[PDB]
Amino acid sequence: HKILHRLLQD
Amino acid sequence: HKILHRLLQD
Amino acid sequence: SLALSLTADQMVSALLDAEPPILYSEYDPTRPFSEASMMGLLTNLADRELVHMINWAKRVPGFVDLTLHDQVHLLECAWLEILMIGLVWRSMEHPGKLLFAPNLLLDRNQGKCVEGMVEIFDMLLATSSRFRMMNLQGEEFVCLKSIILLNSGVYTFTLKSLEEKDHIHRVLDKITDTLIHLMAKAGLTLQQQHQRLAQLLLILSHIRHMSNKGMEHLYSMKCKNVVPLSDLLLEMLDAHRL
Amino acid sequence: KNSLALSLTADQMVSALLDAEPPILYSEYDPTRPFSEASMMGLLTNLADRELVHMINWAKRVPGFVDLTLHDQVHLLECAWLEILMIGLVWRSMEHPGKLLFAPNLLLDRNQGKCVEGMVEIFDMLLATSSRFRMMNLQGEEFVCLKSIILLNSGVYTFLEEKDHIHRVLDKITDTLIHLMAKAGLTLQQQHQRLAQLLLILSHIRHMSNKGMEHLYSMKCKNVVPLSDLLLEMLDAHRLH
Ligand SMILES: C[C@]12CC[C@H](c3ccc(O)cc3C(F)(F)F)C[C@H]1CC[C@@H]2O
Ligand SMILES: C[C@]12CC[C@H](c3ccc(O)cc3C(F)(F)F)C[C@H]1CC[C@@H]2O
């Protein structure tokens, strides 16, 4: 999905 | 010359 | 001048007396809406509200001290914000509804009648719910609206025009003292006073955001000639240059 | 969950925010070639992209932020990202009158903004904001409070009890600002006056953001410069036209 969504949990 | 000009001067 | 010599009560008094009337819409017998029908009523209303706004602005303490040029710039920058905070204020006790006029009360589903306006309606309604939950007072409302008039355009003013910006900021501090005075009189503690002040002013950030969105929408409706716009309205729109 | 954020003193709020501060990044500026509209747009968007990665991790260190579910976290950042880039730019440009310090190796005046169509209007607004902060003698402790306010407030009206949590934290930051001004020796009247002045500037920052968003969008829609996938998605979150 969204890159921002992924980055917020890495 | 604008309409707003005229209305501010009445 | 004289606006600097006003006390907190005289500021409230001056602002309350300067309040424009609540205009009616020319709405109905012809029954329901089309996209052009509703846009017509809204733009016609906004145009007539603009005339009263200008006379209201001149009754705002310290405004007539400014040059004609600066007065034009401030109104050009803030006119839609002022319309929005007014709409939001009088729609406060009508949850889920926008009271454009006493005979024109619209819900968000009626915002769907016009392309891309329901998004703007949603932002206005949420702001109204915010004011309602804060129990926004009329005395607080008139202070906020005056702040919008003086603040929104002051950043986009080298000469001795430094005297103009300094005057605008002196009056702004005066309205701040007034807002605090109202809260202190309301029995709020020092911590509560500063918190509520911050809460009210941060809403003005959202109101700015709504105006920018509204200006774009009104521009898109203007270009396709769905609705006829008054010369005054077209000029206020032109001042934002897209 | 009563929250550690609300259980922070004003001094604890300041320390956490100061520590969470992102570093100042460098531009890919190559002084061997002249500026074009494309190369300058490429330079600034490349910078913004790398700043965004640090912003995301900065946000997670802002007290109360990670208490939100992922969906509002995304929402707040999507709404405030350009605002945050702008207040940061304006802050580090303070001691550079007439210039914008995008990077230590990228210091631009309004005439260099003319290289990109319609960008000089944006530069002017940013420069004026920088002059305002410089005139007010904005302090670093005040700056980090303002930037955190922008993050929590800008997208909160576009959303229950989740919004109440955000407002509790915002009130704590308000308490922190006043605490700072009081410690600086400002009278009680000066405190609420300055508070108002700083917060009203956020209204202009919002305005600059919406204008910058439209400009970035028009650059993208004319294939002037390729945006990163992250940047495309942050831009797409505002719909625009
Ligand atoms: C026709 C529009 C919707 C009504 C709007 C309006 C009119 C009159 C008001 O007293 C308040 C508002 C306001 F909604 F702004 F609050 C004007 C434009 C802005 C965006 C649309 O094109
Ligand atoms: C390329 C633009 C100008 C630079 C801007 C930017 C970049 C990086 C920053 O650290 C700060 C800014 C900011 F200026 F926003 F502060 C991003 C877009 C917004 C409008 C233009 O398209």
Q: What token pair was written down for D134?
A: 């410089």
Q: Which domain holds residue C120?
A: 1-242
Comparing CB atoms, the residue among D70, D233, D234 nearest residue A8 is D70
What is the pairing mode between strands C97-101 and D106-108?
unpaired
Nearest to D129 by CA among D181, D87, D73, D101: D87
CB atoms within 10 A of CB D203: 23
Mapped onto helix, strand or coil, the DSSP state of residue D62 is: coil
Assess whether the C-beta atom of C46 lies below 6 angstroms from ligand 1.
Answer: yes
* DSSP for residue D4: T
Q: Confirm if C111 and C120 have CB atoms less than 8 A apart.
A: yes
- Kindly report the number of other CB atoms within 10 A of residue C32's CB atom: 9
Q: How, if at all, do strands C97-101 and C104-107 pair?
A: antiparallel
- Is D175 in contact with C169 (Cβ distance < 8 A)? no
Q: Sort D23 into a burial class: Cβ within 10 Å, 0-12 / 13-18 / 19+.
A: exposed
Number of domains chain D contains? 1
Residue D100: phi and psi, rounded to 5, are -115, 120
Do chains A and D touch by CB distance (3+ pairs < 8 Å)? yes
Residue of A nearest to D73 (CA): A8
CATH of the domain at D181: 1.10.565.10
**Best A8, A9, A10 residue to mutate vs chain D (most D CBs within 10 Å):** A8
Tokens 């990228």 belong to: D106
Query: What torsion do the CA atoms of C201, C206, C210, C213 make, to the nearest 10 degrees?
Result: 130
Identify the residue whose tokens are 């809204």: C42
**C95: buried, middle or exposed (CB in 10 Å: 19+, 13-18, 0-12)?**
exposed
D48 lines ligand 2 (CB under 6 A): yes
Do residue B4 and residue C236 have CB atoms under 8 angstroms apart? yes
Smallest CA–CA distance, residue C106 to chain B, in Å, is: 30
Residue C67's alpha-carbon distances to C63, C78, C232, D33, in angstroms, are 9, 17, 20, 46
**Residue C29 contacts by C-beta under 8 Å, 6 or more apart in sequence?**
none
Closest CB to C197: pick one of D153, D195, D203: D195
Exposure letters C162-196 (e unless 16+ CB within 10 A, then b):
eebbebbbebbbbbbbbbbbbbeeeebeeeebbbb
Gap between the Cα atoms of C200 and C184, Å rounded: 15
> Which one, of D99, D93, D118, D96, lies nearest residue D37 by Cα?
D118
What residues are paired with C104 via a beta bridge?
C101
Q: Which residue type occupies D81?
A: W
